[PDB]
Design a protein around this ligand. Sequence first.
Ligand SMILES: CCCCCCCCCCCCCCCCCC(=O)OC[C@H](COP(=O)([O-])OCC[N+](C)(C)C)OC(=O)CCCCCCCCCCCCCCCCC
Ligand SMILES: CCCCCCCCCCCCCCCCCC(=O)OC[C@H](COP(=O)([O-])OCC[N+](C)(C)C)OC(=O)CCCCCCCCCCCCCCCCC
Ligand SMILES: CCCCCCCCCCCCCCCCCC(=O)OC[C@H](COP(=O)([O-])OCC[N+](C)(C)C)OC(=O)CCCCCCCCCCCCCCCCC
Ligand SMILES: CCCCCCCCCCCCCCCCCC(=O)OC[C@H](COP(=O)([O-])OCC[N+](C)(C)C)OC(=O)CCCCCCCCCCCCCCCCC
Ligand SMILES: CCCCCCCCCCCCCCCCCCCC(=O)O[C@H](COC(=O)CCCCCCCCCCCCCC)COP(=O)(O)OCCN
Ligand SMILES: CCCCCCCCCCCCCCCCCCCC(=O)O[C@H](COC(=O)CCCCCCCCCCCCCC)COP(=O)(O)OCCN
Ligand SMILES: CCCCCCCCCCCCCCCCCCCC(=O)O[C@H](COC(=O)CCCCCCCCCCCCCC)COP(=O)(O)OCCN
Ligand SMILES: CC(C)CCC[C@@H](C)[C@H]1CC[C@H]2[C@@H]3CC=C4C[C@@H](O)CC[C@]4(C)[C@H]3CC[C@]12C
Ligand SMILES: CC(C)CCC[C@@H](C)[C@H]1CC[C@H]2[C@@H]3CC=C4C[C@@H](O)CC[C@]4(C)[C@H]3CC[C@]12C
Ligand SMILES: CC(C)CCC[C@@H](C)[C@H]1CC[C@H]2[C@@H]3CC=C4C[C@@H](O)CC[C@]4(C)[C@H]3CC[C@]12C
Ligand SMILES: CC(C)CCC[C@@H](C)[C@H]1CC[C@H]2[C@@H]3CC=C4C[C@@H](O)CC[C@]4(C)[C@H]3CC[C@]12C
Ligand SMILES: CC(C)CCC[C@@H](C)[C@H]1CC[C@H]2[C@@H]3CC=C4C[C@@H](O)CC[C@]4(C)[C@H]3CC[C@]12C
Ligand SMILES: CC(C)CCC[C@@H](C)[C@H]1CC[C@H]2[C@@H]3CC=C4C[C@@H](O)CC[C@]4(C)[C@H]3CC[C@]12C
Ligand SMILES: CC(C)CCC[C@@H](C)[C@H]1CC[C@H]2[C@@H]3CC=C4C[C@@H](O)CC[C@]4(C)[C@H]3CC[C@]12C
Ligand SMILES: CC(C)CCC[C@@H](C)[C@H]1CC[C@H]2[C@@H]3CC=C4C[C@@H](O)CC[C@]4(C)[C@H]3CC[C@]12C
Ligand SMILES: CC(C)CCC[C@@H](C)[C@H]1CC[C@H]2[C@@H]3CC=C4C[C@@H](O)CC[C@]4(C)[C@H]3CC[C@]12C
Lengths: 350, 150, 150, 150, 150, 150, 51, 203, 39
Amino acid sequence: SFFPELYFNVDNGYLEGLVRGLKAGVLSQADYLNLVQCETLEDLKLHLQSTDYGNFLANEASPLTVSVIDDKLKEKMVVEFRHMRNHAYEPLASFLDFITYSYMIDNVILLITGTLHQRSIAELVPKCHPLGSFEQMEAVNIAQTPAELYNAILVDTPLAAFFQDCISEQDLDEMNIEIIRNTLYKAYLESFYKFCTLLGGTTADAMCPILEFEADRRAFIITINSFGTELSKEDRAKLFPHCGRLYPEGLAQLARADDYEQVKNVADYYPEYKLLFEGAGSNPGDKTLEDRFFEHEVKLNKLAFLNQFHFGVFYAFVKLKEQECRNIVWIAECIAQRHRAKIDNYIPIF
Amino acid sequence: NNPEYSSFFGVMGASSAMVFSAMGAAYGTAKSGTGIAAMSVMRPELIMKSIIPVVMAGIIAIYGLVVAVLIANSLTDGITLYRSFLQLGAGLSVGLSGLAAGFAIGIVGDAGVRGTAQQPRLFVGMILILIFAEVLGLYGLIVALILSTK
Amino acid sequence: NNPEYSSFFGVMGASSAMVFSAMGAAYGTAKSGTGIAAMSVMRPELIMKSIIPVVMAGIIAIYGLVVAVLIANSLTDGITLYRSFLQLGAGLSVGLSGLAAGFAIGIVGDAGVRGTAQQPRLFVGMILILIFAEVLGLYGLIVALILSTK
Amino acid sequence: NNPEYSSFFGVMGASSAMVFSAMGAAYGTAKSGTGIAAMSVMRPELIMKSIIPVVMAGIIAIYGLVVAVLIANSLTDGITLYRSFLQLGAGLSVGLSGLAAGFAIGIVGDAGVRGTAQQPRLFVGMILILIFAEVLGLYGLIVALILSTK
Amino acid sequence: NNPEYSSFFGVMGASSAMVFSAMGAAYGTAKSGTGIAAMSVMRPELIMKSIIPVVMAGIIAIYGLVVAVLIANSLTDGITLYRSFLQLGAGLSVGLSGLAAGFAIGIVGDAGVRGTAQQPRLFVGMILILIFAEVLGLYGLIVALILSTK
Amino acid sequence: NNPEYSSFFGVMGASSAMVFSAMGAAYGTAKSGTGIAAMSVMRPELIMKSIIPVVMAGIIAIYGLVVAVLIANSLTDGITLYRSFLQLGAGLSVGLSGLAAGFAIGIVGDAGVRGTAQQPRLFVGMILILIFAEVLGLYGLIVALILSTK
Amino acid sequence: AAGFAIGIVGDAGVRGTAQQPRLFVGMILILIFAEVLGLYGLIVALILSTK
Amino acid sequence: TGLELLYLGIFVAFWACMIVVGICYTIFDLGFRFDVAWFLTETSPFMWSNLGIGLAISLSVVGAAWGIYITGSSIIGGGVKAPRIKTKNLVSIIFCEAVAIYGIIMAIVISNMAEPFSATDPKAIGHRNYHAGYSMFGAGLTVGLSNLFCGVCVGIVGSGAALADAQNPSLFVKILIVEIFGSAIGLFGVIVAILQTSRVKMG
Amino acid sequence: GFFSPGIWMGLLTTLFMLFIFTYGLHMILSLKTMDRFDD
Ligand SMILES: CCCCCCCCCCCCCCCCCC(=O)OC[C@H](COP(=O)([O-])OCC[N+](C)(C)C)OC(=O)CCCCCCCCCCCCCCCCC
Ligand SMILES: CCCCCCCCCCCCCCCCCC(=O)OC[C@H](COP(=O)([O-])OCC[N+](C)(C)C)OC(=O)CCCCCCCCCCCCCCCCC
Ligand SMILES: CCCCCCCCCCCCCCCCCC(=O)OC[C@H](COP(=O)([O-])OCC[N+](C)(C)C)OC(=O)CCCCCCCCCCCCCCCCC
Ligand SMILES: CCCCCCCCCCCCCCCCCC(=O)OC[C@H](COP(=O)([O-])OCC[N+](C)(C)C)OC(=O)CCCCCCCCCCCCCCCCC
Ligand SMILES: CCCCCCCCCCCCCCCCCCCC(=O)O[C@H](COC(=O)CCCCCCCCCCCCCC)COP(=O)(O)OCCN
Ligand SMILES: CCCCCCCCCCCCCCCCCCCC(=O)O[C@H](COC(=O)CCCCCCCCCCCCCC)COP(=O)(O)OCCN
Ligand SMILES: CCCCCCCCCCCCCCCCCCCC(=O)O[C@H](COC(=O)CCCCCCCCCCCCCC)COP(=O)(O)OCCN
Ligand SMILES: CC(C)CCC[C@@H](C)[C@H]1CC[C@H]2[C@@H]3CC=C4C[C@@H](O)CC[C@]4(C)[C@H]3CC[C@]12C
Ligand SMILES: CC(C)CCC[C@@H](C)[C@H]1CC[C@H]2[C@@H]3CC=C4C[C@@H](O)CC[C@]4(C)[C@H]3CC[C@]12C
Ligand SMILES: CC(C)CCC[C@@H](C)[C@H]1CC[C@H]2[C@@H]3CC=C4C[C@@H](O)CC[C@]4(C)[C@H]3CC[C@]12C
Ligand SMILES: CC(C)CCC[C@@H](C)[C@H]1CC[C@H]2[C@@H]3CC=C4C[C@@H](O)CC[C@]4(C)[C@H]3CC[C@]12C
Ligand SMILES: CC(C)CCC[C@@H](C)[C@H]1CC[C@H]2[C@@H]3CC=C4C[C@@H](O)CC[C@]4(C)[C@H]3CC[C@]12C
Ligand SMILES: CC(C)CCC[C@@H](C)[C@H]1CC[C@H]2[C@@H]3CC=C4C[C@@H](O)CC[C@]4(C)[C@H]3CC[C@]12C
Ligand SMILES: CC(C)CCC[C@@H](C)[C@H]1CC[C@H]2[C@@H]3CC=C4C[C@@H](O)CC[C@]4(C)[C@H]3CC[C@]12C
Ligand SMILES: CC(C)CCC[C@@H](C)[C@H]1CC[C@H]2[C@@H]3CC=C4C[C@@H](O)CC[C@]4(C)[C@H]3CC[C@]12C
Ligand SMILES: CC(C)CCC[C@@H](C)[C@H]1CC[C@H]2[C@@H]3CC=C4C[C@@H](O)CC[C@]4(C)[C@H]3CC[C@]12C
């Protein structure tokens, strides 16, 4: 073993305790039921004030809207993550930066989409995810030139390493934005897995399963969603991350797959995914495959907290709070639209 | 008479018996405790049962102590070089066997405690494996005794 | 008419035989341990069946113990330097052969118990591989005996 | 007459022939078992055919054992220091050549079993490479015998 | 006349000639095997044609074996310290030259077999490069034989 | 009468008492300082309150200085080996104790400054820990005062 | 050791003082607490060298 | 891992040198020069005894500080949202500090066994003095290293218990048991040290 | 000889103090400064 016990708390013990304290504030099942029993978004805020959220929504306008609640939840999560990052040292700082790359990959896609369609880059920043903010000024005032934007990404963005998967700036106008996003995410996931493996010890043990499931679900859902599209099998197989547990002959079989039945057959070889596929009836009124994968992801993130001396706790907390914010937004949507019947579709945590 | 330096190896035997066995027991207890504490938030009712690995790790220390005591009681300033080497060998054997058993107990106890948090049926299995690791320390003790009494 | 430090090496045989083997066994009992835990969450019914690696690792320890005790019973105050070297060689042989066998058993057992959760047919295969790894330790014991009973 | 420390080098030759060959065989068996476990998830029918690496790794251990036993039979109270050097050289040669051969067999067998899960035609090629990675140990054995029986 | 320890360097020379050459050949074989396993999935019909780097590594091992046997047949009890040093130098020269040649062969063969999966014309080039690595070991052998026959 | 080198060890003790303690203090004065720099951007009013860790680190240095002076004023030309090694033991005690206490103070203060920035109630809590860490160094000093005046 | 402490403390303080000027005095104090460490060594050195 | 590389290089170089030096001494019939007796005998017992006392205190303090910071980082990180921890979990720190206390006590119990010889010839120094030095060194090693490991273990368990306490108050009372077990090792070391220097008498 | 009792004692003392100094310097060199400050 790497004996992370002896030296982990030297630099990251305070943040380990702090992030666990933050995780203690994630809504439990009872809080979710209490919020489910609300009648109006005002009552939702009332019932939410008794939780860790407190008065995060008191300032906002009385006529609450789901967009306002979502924005406030995202702002709170961003503030907490930024506070944790500012107090983190070199290794944990790199880990948290890797966490933010996931949103930087979507933000850069937004930037290139706007630039190619000739919309001011400065006007796209408001729609970018705060956790992946491009505070660098090299990618601003680009004058709507895709080549300049690509050079800015390569020079003054941590995505330069992931943009070497592409070959040139022409690809920005050549490949579809979805293919670019998925290639960038594949490269980012592989880099993250390599980083976590290099960290080793409890970090690798508690973090490699989560990235492995991420890769496997990416493969499954890219296969399932691309059946009816022009995305060819050869180009589809390029989007499968190689970190997953499907890498030997699993990803290949998925690439050869031509129907959901074949994807289910491929998943059958792995009992942990066999159960997820079995439970995903996908017919109206029952959990879909994406919901089952969300449940498994939440389970893995929760199990990431049984280890102590590792950085996987921060990634697990970020993902768990992301799911909690999505659950609260879903409850608010069900309240606003009066669709109480599906109000139980939220994925509980703890 | 015997050499002036003969007692050195017996002294080092006692020191090794205690130090390495203490290292093993300390690692076992630390690993098991950091697994148990992290489990308890999820499964608070298991702590007591999950204390079993810690006890096993503690037993390793006892073994060291036992042998150490022997070497610290049979060690005079004028023991033959042969007896001093025997005590050094007994001490090294018990200490390093206890170190290995403590590492194994820490790893197995942490993993099994977390699994029991996730799968109660694993409990008995864990115990078996822990015993198989604990026995290792016992083996060392046996050999140590055979060497220290001889 | 023999050096009084002759027994030293012989002792370092016994000690080693029980130390290194134990370490090897520990590693086995450690790695397999973890594996069982990891695979016990989803497939509880295989916990007892998937305890073979640990048992094999345990046997490795016994090998060392045997040799150690044998050496610990062949030691004498006037042990010649030749017999002392024989016992040191036997102890190192058994201890480090058991260490290598324990490493192999730990790795193979972890991999096999994790795979058998997904591929039942692998079980027998795992056993075969484990046997091969076990055989390595056995070889050491053989040599040790040949060296320790000349 | 002859130095009393010659038997030390003889027993070191025996214990090296055993220990290093056992370490090589253990590494080969561990890597091949990991590869077999990874492969068998999708291709169960190849659990047995993919055991050839392990066997070819086990053979390496046998080589070491052979030399070890030979040395353990050639040892005597009055081996000339030159004879002890011959035995030590034979033991080192067989043990370390077997260690290198075991590393090669482990890597080649793991890669070959992983590849054969996706390409059956690789099997034969894999076998050849394993042979080329096994004769190395054989070479060591030869030299050891030429040194041990001189 | 000659010191009783002269044969030590000769036996070490033989053991080095075998061990280091075997290590080099083993590394070459391992790297080439991994390369062939990666290659064969997409281009199976190149497996037999791509076995050449393993053959070259085997030839390096054979160089080592030749020098080792030569030293092990010119090694006598009354071996002059000067001739013992000559044989040690021959062994080290061949062993480490073969180690370097095996490293070069492994890296070059891995790269060449991987590339030839995508560019057939590279095959011939690879062979050339491999020969340029092979001669390295040959050079060592040359020197070794000189020193062995001096 | 006494060896001309007898004064070396004592001198080193004195230097050690100054050096390691300083290192300890330095680490504290570094870590806490970093923490303060991180805290003071949002909570400037806590700078003076949060300077306590640094002060405690400084105290550690003082202890070392004391012992160093206490040894540097007692080094006589005919300092016997007994007194020389008593002073060496005192120096090692105080130096390593101050080093460890400085590390603990630095880490605890770097955590507690930020914690008190977040939760004011932690301030006293932080202190309640720091003093403990500090007295560890004190304990070393105490033993030094027992030794250098034995 | 004092140079290590002064490096860490002074760098952190000069970078933070760009954000919060009130930290300046704080930094200075900490630097003094580091500086005295070297001074302590000097003292002992003299007590040894001029003995 | 640059510093790790330096340490590994030094270790490998030292032990390769030791292997080659031992081979040369054994083979060249120069074993008589490798007098381990001469090393253990000419080396003054005062060196061994004072290294023993210094280690008894310093390694115990090192373990106490290691555990104290290991558990204090977790205590002060958890207490940001659950300050009650600072009140309840000081026990963990106490246990760590207890380790150091044993150290000083054993140091005293060892330092009381010292006494000059007025002799330099090994026959004059004698078995009693040489064994006194060796046993004081061994007792120092035992107490210091047992206390080091016990302090580190108690610190790890205390950090775990503080992280568990931040989320459920009713867990610390049941996790302290582990700390108690982790503490016993310290005591064991002390006992053994007391047994090693029971019949030690320099002079 | 290569070593003498005074040289041996000095070397062992210096070895222990070099171990202590290496531990201290390894812990000091691990010191890292924050790369960001709160807004
Ligand atoms: C790289 C990291 C930094 C270094 C950290 C590690 C430092 C290691 C400390 C080295 C001290 C070793 C003790 C020296 C005394 C013993 C020497 C000896 O055995 O020979 C004299 C002994 C005894 O000699 P003697 O007793 O006949 O001589 C008469 C006595 N004197 C000389 C004192 C007057 O045997 C010989 O005579 C051998 C002669 C040949 C010399 C062989 C030396 C062995 C090592 C040679 C190769 C180097 C090894 C490392 C390989 C490369 C690196 C991996
Ligand atoms: C791959 C590594 C390369 C191999 C070489 C490694 C470096 C070793 C060289 C270190 C420098 C020492 C050179 C000799 C200095 C003079 C010593 C002297 O006077 O000798 C007197 C010594 C001792 O004295 P003596 O024995 O000659 O005198 C008689 C003494 N009585 C009566 C007691 C027997 O003997 C010699 O004459 C030695 C001559 C040859 C020494 C060669 C160096 C020894 C180490 C060689 C390496 C050992 C490992 C071999 C296998 C390696 C395989 C990887
Ligand atoms: C790396 C982990 C540690 C293991 C390797 C290193 C171990 C030793 C390191 C400490 C320094 C060297 C110690 C030996 C000093 C020499 C003592 C001496 O001359 O007396 C010998 C003694 C006495 O020598 P003597 O000349 O007095 O002979 C006896 C003569 N009468 C009886 C008349 C008095 O006898 C021995 O030969 C004992 C064996 C130990 C000496 C050899 C050391 C081995 C070094 C490792 C290499 C092993 C070779 C095989 C390699 C493969 C291994 C698997
Ligand atoms: C706070 C601690 C900081 C870290 C630790 C660093 C401390 C270093 C202290 C200096 C080295 C001391 C080594 C041991 C010798 C002690 C003195 C002693 O007892 O000797 C009396 C002895 C007494 O001798 P004797 O009388 O016992 O010998 C028997 C009689 N004769 C000599 C005739 C055979 O005499 C000596 O001075 C022996 C020589 C020892 C010299 C050892 C070499 C030291 C090299 C210095 C380090 C390298 C410097 C260059 C670095 C490069 C840049 C980084
Ligand atoms: C491997 C090939 C064979 C090597 C054989 C020769 C012996 C080993 C020599 C080293 C060989 C490998 C090269 C390592 C160079 C030194 C270590 C890395 C660089 C270095 O020292 O800088 C930083 C430490 O600062 C410093 O400069 C502090 C270091 C100096 C401290 C000196 C005190 C120790 C004295 C030795 C006694 C203690 C013995 C303990 C076992 C560490 O860099 P980083 O890791 O932070 O950054 C990552 C990259 N550097
Ligand atoms: C495969 C790896 C290698 C394994 C082989 C073992 C290697 C161990 C390394 C230690 C060295 C080898 C041991 C044998 C050599 C001992 C020295 C013999 C030389 C000699 O003749 O010295 C005698 C004194 O030494 C003595 O009698 C000393 C006796 C003690 C020797 C053993 C001590 C080694 C250190 C053990 C430390 C253990 C630490 C545990 C934490 C003479 O003396 P004399 O009475 O004739 O004097 C006459 C004066 N006029
Ligand atoms: C630049 C920085 C400052 C300077 C460096 C200071 C730090 C490094 C120094 C540490 C020591 C390193 C060297 C160790 C040498 C081992 C023995 C060498 C073999 C040898 O020839 O020794 C013979 C005696 O050795 C014996 O009697 C054998 C005793 C072996 C004991 C070794 C214990 C310490 C090292 C290993 C353990 C480390 C853990 C701490 C205990 C000498 O023979 P002669 O001809 O002079 O004899 C005269 C009468 N016969
Ligand atoms: C098993 C451990 C924890 C100790 C607990 C039981 C105690 C009382 C037993 C277990 C093994 C026993 C030792 C076994 C071997 C010998 C040699 C024998 O000829 C007489 C006594 C003596 C020295 C025994 C003393 C008592 C002993 C230490
Ligand atoms: C006591 C419990 C833990 C059972 C474990 C058995 C161990 C600790 C004890 C109990 C009885 C002991 C044996 C009793 C008698 C002797 C004879 C003596 O000449 C050598 C030791 C030897 C051979 C002992 C070895 C260790 C032993 C087997
Ligand atoms: C079940 C208990 C006894 C422990 C498990 C290991 C047992 C089977 C081992 C441990 C030590 C072994 C003994 C070691 C040495 C000897 C001396 C030899 O000339 C006859 C066999 C004999 C007497 C062995 C018999 C088997 C033995 C008792
Ligand atoms: C497959 C079976 C036979 C192997 C398992 C048991 C092994 C450890 C036993 C069975 C028979 C044993 C052999 C029987 C008799 C002797 C003669 C003795 O002077 C040296 C040891 C030697 C040569 C033994 C070596 C170890 C041995 C091979
Ligand atoms: C696993 C098995 C089938 C593989 C081969 C291993 C056995 C048969 C080998 C290993 C050691 C060998 C022995 C090595 C040395 C000697 C002494 C020699 O003067 C004659 C033969 C004899 C007695 C050998 C017989 C065969 C032997 C026992
Ligand atoms: C033929 C190939 C496959 C090699 C397989 C057999 C090898 C390992 C063995 C079996 C019998 C051995 C031979 C048996 C006896 C002698 C005579 C001796 O004075 C020198 C070595 C020599 C000549 C041996 C060389 C190696 C040898 C040929
Ligand atoms: C495929 C592998 C095994 C090739 C083996 C290498 C061959 C070519 C080498 C290695 C050692 C060599 C032998 C070394 C010594 C002798 C004795 C001498 O009086 C004549 C030639 C003869 C008999 C050599 C023949 C060729 C030889 C056997
Ligand atoms: C495969 C081949 C090319 C590698 C070996 C190269 C050949 C050409 C070299 C290497 C060593 C050489 C030998 C070295 C020394 C002597 C002794 C001298 O009195 C006659 C020539 C003779 C016998 C040489 C003949 C040629 C030789 C055998
Ligand atoms: C670089 C580090 C690893 C240390 C250097 C290796 C040491 C062990 C080697 C290197 C060169 C060696 C020296 C080379 C030659 C001689 C002359 C001989 O008559 C006595 C031994 C003596 C004086 C050797 C002592 C050991 C020695 C100093």
